[PDB]
Design a protein around this motif. Structure first.
Motif, PDB file in Angstrom:
ATOM      1  N   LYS A  66      12.130   8.202  31.344  1.00 48.16           N
ATOM      2  CA  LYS A  66      12.997   8.830  32.327  1.00 48.16           C
ATOM      3  C   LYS A  66      14.093   9.667  31.686  1.00 48.16           C
ATOM      4  N   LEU A  67      14.388   9.446  30.402  1.00 46.84           N
ATOM      5  CA  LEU A  67      15.328  10.302  29.688  1.00 46.84           C
ATOM      6  C   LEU A  67      14.936  11.763  29.788  1.00 46.84           C
ATOM      7  N   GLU A  68      13.639  12.044  29.824  1.00 47.24           N
ATOM      8  CA  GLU A  68      13.147  13.407  29.861  1.00 47.24           C
ATOM      9  C   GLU A  68      12.193  13.677  31.006  1.00 47.24           C
ATOM     10  N   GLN A  69      11.613  12.649  31.606  1.00 52.00           N
ATOM     11  CA  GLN A  69      10.743  12.840  32.749  1.00 52.00           C
ATOM     12  C   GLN A  69      11.493  12.814  34.068  1.00 52.00           C
ATOM     13  N   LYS A  70      12.777  12.482  34.056  1.00 49.75           N
ATOM     14  CA  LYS A  70      13.584  12.458  35.265  1.00 49.75           C
ATOM     15  C   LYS A  70      14.449  13.707  35.291  1.00 49.75           C
ATOM     16  N   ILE A  71      14.349  14.472  36.365  1.00 47.68           N
ATOM     17  CA  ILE A  71      14.922  15.803  36.420  1.00 47.68           C
ATOM     18  C   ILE A  71      15.829  15.874  37.637  1.00 47.68           C
ATOM     19  N   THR A  73      17.637  17.737  39.948  1.00 45.28           N
ATOM     20  CA  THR A  73      17.500  19.124  40.343  1.00 45.28           C
ATOM     21  C   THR A  73      18.542  19.463  41.393  1.00 45.28           C
ATOM     22  N   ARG A  74      18.943  20.727  41.418  1.00 49.09           N
ATOM     23  CA  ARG A  74      19.999  21.179  42.302  1.00 49.09           C
ATOM     24  C   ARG A  74      19.607  22.533  42.859  1.00 49.09           C
ATOM     25  N   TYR A  75      20.386  23.017  43.813  1.00 47.03           N
ATOM     26  CA  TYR A  75      19.987  24.211  44.533  1.00 47.03           C
ATOM     27  C   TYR A  75      21.211  25.032  44.885  1.00 47.03           C
ATOM     28  N   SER A  76      21.133  26.333  44.628  1.00 49.73           N
ATOM     29  CA  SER A  76      22.258  27.227  44.839  1.00 49.73           C
ATOM     30  C   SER A  76      22.221  27.932  46.181  1.00 49.73           C
ATOM     31  N   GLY A  77      21.066  27.989  46.828  1.00 50.82           N
ATOM     32  CA  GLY A  77      20.863  28.876  47.941  1.00 50.82           C
ATOM     33  C   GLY A  77      20.369  30.247  47.548  1.00 50.82           C
ATOM     34  N   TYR A  78      20.486  30.586  46.353  1.00 50.26           N
ATOM     35  CA  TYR A  78      19.969  31.847  45.867  1.00 50.26           C
ATOM     36  C   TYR A  78      18.508  31.700  45.479  1.00 50.26           C
ATOM     37  N   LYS A  83      17.755  24.564  40.097  1.00 48.20           N
ATOM     38  CA  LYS A  83      18.226  24.296  38.748  1.00 48.20           C
ATOM     39  C   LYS A  83      17.789  22.895  38.350  1.00 48.20           C
ATOM     40  N   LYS A  84      16.800  22.813  37.472  1.00 45.49           N
ATOM     41  CA  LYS A  84      16.302  21.533  37.003  1.00 45.49           C
ATOM     42  C   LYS A  84      17.124  21.057  35.819  1.00 45.49           C
ATOM     43  N   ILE A  85      17.304  19.746  35.731  1.00 43.29           N
ATOM     44  CA  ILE A  85      18.121  19.144  34.685  1.00 43.29           C
ATOM     45  C   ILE A  85      17.420  17.905  34.154  1.00 43.29           C
ATOM     46  N   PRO A  86      16.971  17.896  32.908  1.00 36.23           N
ATOM     47  CA  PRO A  86      16.486  16.647  32.327  1.00 36.23           C
ATOM     48  C   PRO A  86      17.603  15.621  32.291  1.00 36.23           C
TER      49      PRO A  86
END
Ligand SMILES: [Zn+2]
Lengths: 140, 204, 173, 37, 58
Positions: A66-71, A73-78, A83-86
């Motif tokens: 999960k250190l790297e397989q868990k992402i 993620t966020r969203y700007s509306g654009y 925006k994915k984040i490990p």
RNA sequence: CGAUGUCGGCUCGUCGCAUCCUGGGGCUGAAGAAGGUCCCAAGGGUUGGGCUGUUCGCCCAUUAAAGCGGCACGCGAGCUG
RNA sequence: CGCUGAAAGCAUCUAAGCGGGAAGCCCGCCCCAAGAUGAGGCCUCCCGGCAGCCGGUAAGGACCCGGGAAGACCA
């Protein structure tokens, strides 16, 4: 004989060492204390759970890859604003935001929930500006 | 990162080695330091510069105290150079030298509520062949029912310009210390007399 | 037949087990082996060993790897490790410059290699090169980078070779 | 690197190894070098 | 709500809700979730005795 | 079916990658150069014109290339017809 | 694509590990930005009658002009 309603009492701060504890489990117990469903005078429509301060949140641990397989993620509306984040990157950047997120997912939505999360206080590392608040240690 | 406040006095070309290199002229100095952002005190390192001086009857008490905390004359405009620890008490053009690459920032000439062509260079529509009242409209703006909305940042009308702008990697054509003038190749954002800030370029 | 194998520990070698790590100081130098806490260290004078607490795949695996790694360690601080490389191709050669290594195998500029900590760049010839030090893996990593610089050729013996690296090139024109 | 779904030994030197979870048919022969996918 | 409050008060004495219910059911007591809750909030000693007979059921 | 306006062009894009170029690499019947094939890769680009309502296609001259598709075969309370 | 390497006496880029590795991702460049309601931080300035209340008020601001490469208005 209406069911008892409690009087608005002083919530009791509680310290929690996030170090070593599992992410999901510890976040769960954080949610339980934060809801105040440990108190026999519990009530749903009222924020009477205890303030929580957690230390060494960066020291949190996670099973598997999960250190790297868990992402996170966020969203700007654009367009393309996904925006994915490990998980590791989220650790180095903002360790506290990890626990704050994994606990925000475990609280009831709506305004009462938000005030609950506002009753939360994560701190990477050992310290916290709450000595005056008397954060009692409570093993979990 | 050195940098000085300045004002755009105008553009001009000069003859440097048989080349009419156009430049802009920038009265930069003399910028006195008024306060220093220290990380223990302000979380980071930077400084605060005054340019130009101000009539003392045009300064509120709080600003005045802010100057008396330093030894600085009351000054009209005040800014900060991020990550710059000037040793002296007044930054001037001496920090800069000809040939040095800089980056200049100033407010562009505010073009009011600009149309969509002037703001984003859209093509508009044709001028003949029957184009009905849409000669400068942006045409369509999205799709049909999916997603049935308009994305964020869809290029539409609005205030083009009048914003902070940083043109970068310019050349310091020449320095004029006795006048505190600065000759920088290329154009600078902002109208003549518009406040601007010059800094070392972040390029290499 | 490998974790079964005992790791003979001939002096001068300091062997000292801390949880998850050993400590061996030989004449060449010093180092530590990160060790499987599930694995056990038979710290015995003359020979130290390793013991898998079970017989799972993970414990014959960690047992064998633990043993091999440890013995490689004491071989490291004890007598170190070395590797040779045969620069070939016409005009391709090398020569030490300070600690770092000069090496020219036909670029728009020669190439130098920085020796990490110790990593010896012995230049017996410009054709052949040695790299030594305490570490076994780190040596093969450095020399690994070396052969990575100008690898062997498919149609010519024109390039970096490992000491013992054969050359099976296909024909050409 | 012959990529495919039926990675298999071709020569006896075709040697299978489950590297990084994938199945690679690593061999001395470059042509037999296979990746399952 | 009654199961919630009761579950909290019972967990303050070592056992959980299901264990307490199983006890009282085995303990031959019929007091319901409402009065159990009100005891747990009002009579920590009386409710404490209820937990006493509860683990007593085991 | 007490209305969801239908091809095409224009404007404006956004997105998928089953990648046309640009990046990285494997194998080669890869001497070099040039290639083929496959793998990873969607950041950016993907020209102008003749014919035709055309999309499409052919052609012209190029280009690194002159990608394929979704978005109501996107987009007529944006245009044309 | 690798170093070390056991399971599996060998070998193995992997299973413990370490590394190299792309117009890719993150930062890095510019811009916005504390309604970031988590409303942040620094400097400076200000000081009573009936958790408050009111008072003129402090600092300061506003309105009002005269304008402005600022601008639809507003700002
Ligand atoms: Zn084979």
């Amino acid at each position: 004989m209406k069911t008892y309603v409690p009087k608005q009492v002083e919530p009791r701060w509680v310290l929690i060492d996030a170090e070593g504890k599992t992410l999901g489990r510890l976040a769960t117990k954080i949610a339980t204390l934060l809801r105040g469903k440990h108190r026999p005078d519990w009530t749903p429509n009222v924020a009477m759970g205890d303030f929580v301060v957690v230390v060494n949140a960066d020291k949190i641990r996670v099973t598997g890859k999960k250190l790297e397989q868990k992402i996170y993620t966020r969203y700007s509306g654009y367009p393309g604003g996904l925006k994915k984040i490990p998980l590791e990157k989220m650790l180095a950047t903002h360790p506290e935001r990890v626990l704050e997120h994994a606990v925000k997912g475990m609280l009831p939505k709506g305004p009462l929930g938000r005030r609950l999360f506002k009753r939360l206080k994560v701190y990477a590392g050992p310290d916290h500006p709450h000595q005056a608040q008397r954060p009692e240690k409570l093993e979990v | 990162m050195k940098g000085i406040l300045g004002v755009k006095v105008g553009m001009t070309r000069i003859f440097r080695d048989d080349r009419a290199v156009p430049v802009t002229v920038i009265l930069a100095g003399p910028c006195p330091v008024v306060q220093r952002r220290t990380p223990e005190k302000d979380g980071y390192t930077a400084v605060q510069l005054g340019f130009l001086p101000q009539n003392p009857k045009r300064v509120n008490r709080p600003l005045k105290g802010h100057f008396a905390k330093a030894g600085v004359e009351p000054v009209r405009i005040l800014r900060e150079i991020r990550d710059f620890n000037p040793e002296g008490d007044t930054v001037t053009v001496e920090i800069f030298k000809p040939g040095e690459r800089v980056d200049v920032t100033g407010t562009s000439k505010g073009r009011g509520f600009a149309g969509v062509m002037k703001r984003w260079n859209f093509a508009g529509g044709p001028d003949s062949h029957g184009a009905h009242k849409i000669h400068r409209h942006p045409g369509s703006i999205g799709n049909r029912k999916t997603p049935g909305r308009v994305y964020k940042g869809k290029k539409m009308a609005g205030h083009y310009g009048a914003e902070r702008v940083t043109v970068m990697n310019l050349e310091v054509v020449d320095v004029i210390p006795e006048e505190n003038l600065l000759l920088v190749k290329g154009a600078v954002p902002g109208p003549n007399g518009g406040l601007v800030i010059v800094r070392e370029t972040k390029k290499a | 037949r490998i974790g079964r194998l005992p790791i003979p520990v001939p002096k001068g070698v300091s062997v000292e087990v801390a949880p998850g790590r050993v400590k061996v100081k030989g004449p060449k130098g010093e180092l530590e082996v990160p060790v499987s806490p599930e694995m056990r260290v038979v710290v015995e004078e003359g020979v130290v060993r390793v013991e898998r607490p079970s017989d799972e795949r993970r414990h014959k695996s960690l047992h064998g790897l633990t043993r091999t790694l440890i013995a490689n360690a004491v071989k490291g601080v004890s007598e170190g490790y070395s590797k040779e490389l045969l620069i070939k191709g016409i005009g391709y050669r090398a020569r030490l410059v300070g600690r770092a290594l000069e090496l020219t195998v036909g670029f728009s500029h020669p190439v130098v290699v920085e020796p990490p900590e110790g990593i010896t760049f012995e230049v017996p010839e410009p054709t052949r090169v040695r790299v030594s030090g305490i570490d076994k893996q780190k040596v093969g990593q450095v020399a690994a980078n070396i052969r990575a610089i100008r690898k062997p050729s498919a149609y010519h013996e024109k390039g970096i070779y490992y000491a013992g690296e054969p050359v099976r090139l296909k024909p050409g024109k | 690197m012959k990529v495919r779904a039926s990675v298999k030994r071709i020569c006896d030197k075709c040697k299978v190894i489950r590297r990084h979870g994938r199945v690679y048919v690593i061999c001395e022969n470059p042509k037999h070098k296979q990746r399952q996918g | 709500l009654w199961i919630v409050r009761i579950n909290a008060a019972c967990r303050q004495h070592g056992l959980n809700y299901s264990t307490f219910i199983h006890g009282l059911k085995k303990a031959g007591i019929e007091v319901d979730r409402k009065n159990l809750a009100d005891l747990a909030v009002r009579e920590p000693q009386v409710f404490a005795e209820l937990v006493e007979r509860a683990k007593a059921a085991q």
